[PDB]
């Protein structure tokens, strides 16, 4: 099965280096067709960080793609961090790659594919749950390995480091030398807790969406991996993180919504935190891997 990616830009499709296949950059669009001997397959995978501009073309080009190959082929919209498990196979063994001093997630859960995403290079983009690579301008760095990490982050880590062409020195958490916190700008609280700290999968976090858009006021789960895209403006989350739940509040909620996820998480019964946008803190930012503090 033949896999073929395109970057967008910038009104059109330039082919992708094949050596970078699964390295994207988080502020473009990318084609990628997958060819069976039968039918098509266009993924479109659309940046967190993309311009709407770059959305558009994406959209254009993939109906351009489509319609050369006869109409045949299936469209699968893929936002960044939201790839159905068909896509990450086209990826053989390499880890996805999302795109001086640099800092890297990595990040696996429950199968799917190890997942790597750069980062602000602050102390408290840290996650005791999952490994890091903090690329310095010197073409050296670390690799600090989370308390609650598996060894395939480490070797997804491992990896980016030689994308990079970074000479690693492993630390672990706890056990890291002070020229790591002077390369991240000093020694902060970073995203962990109890849970986190523990590689544990027995209770993974569920994410729910409460609405009352429908008139009604529904409860419904985020199916797979969510990631931060998944946290609607306009409603009411519900993150169950087992040790705790949290009701993130967005800016444009009814306050209906906000009052009847008490309701609802206390019917769904440990701690129930409430939570305002913009103003989440490090122990529910840890539950998703990044976490773009600047988006709106
Ligand atoms: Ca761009
Ligand atoms: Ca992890
Ligand atoms: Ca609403």
């Known amino acids: 099965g033949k896999v073929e990616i395109w970057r967008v830009e910038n009104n059109g499709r330039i082919q992708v280096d094949q050596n970078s296949y699964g390295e994207f ?172 700290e523990t590689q544990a999968e027995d209770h993974p976090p569920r994410l729910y969406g409460c609405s009352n858009k429908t008139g009604r006021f529904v409860i419904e789960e985020i199916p797979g991996e969510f990631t931060q895209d998944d946290l609607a403006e306009d409603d009411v989350m519900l993150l169950d993180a087992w040790e705790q739940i949290f009701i993130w509040i967005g800016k444009d909620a009814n306050e209906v919504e906000k009052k009847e996820s008490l309701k609802s998480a206390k019917m769904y019964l440990t701690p129930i935190v409430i939570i305002k946008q913009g103003h989440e803190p490090p122990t529910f930012t840890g539950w998703f891997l990044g976490w773009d503090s600047s988006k709106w």
């Open 25 to 196: 950059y988080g502020g473009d669009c990318y084609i990628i067709l997958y060819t069976y001997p039968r039918g098509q397959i266009i993924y479109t995978w659309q940046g967190a960080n993309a311009t709407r501009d770059e959305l558009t073309t994406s959209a254009f080009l993939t109906v351009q793609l489509d319609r050369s190959l006869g109409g045949q082929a299936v469209q699968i919209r893929v936002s960044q961090g939201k790839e159905p498990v068909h896509l990450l196979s086209l990826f053989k063994d390499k880890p996805l790659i999302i795109y001086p001093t640099r800092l890297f997630q990595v990040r696996r859960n429950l199968a799917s594919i190890t997942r790597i995403v750069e980062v602000d290079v602050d102390a408290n983009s840290l996650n005791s749950n999952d490994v890091f690579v903090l690329k310095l301008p010197q073409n050296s760095g670390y690799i600090w390995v989370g308390k609650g990490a598996s060894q395939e982050e480490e070797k997804g880590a491992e990896y980016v480091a030689s994308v990079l062409k970074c000479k690693t020195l492993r630390i672990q958490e706890g056990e890291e030398p002070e020229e790591f916190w002077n390369s991240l700008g000093g020694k902060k609280d970073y995203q962990t807790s109890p849970l986190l």
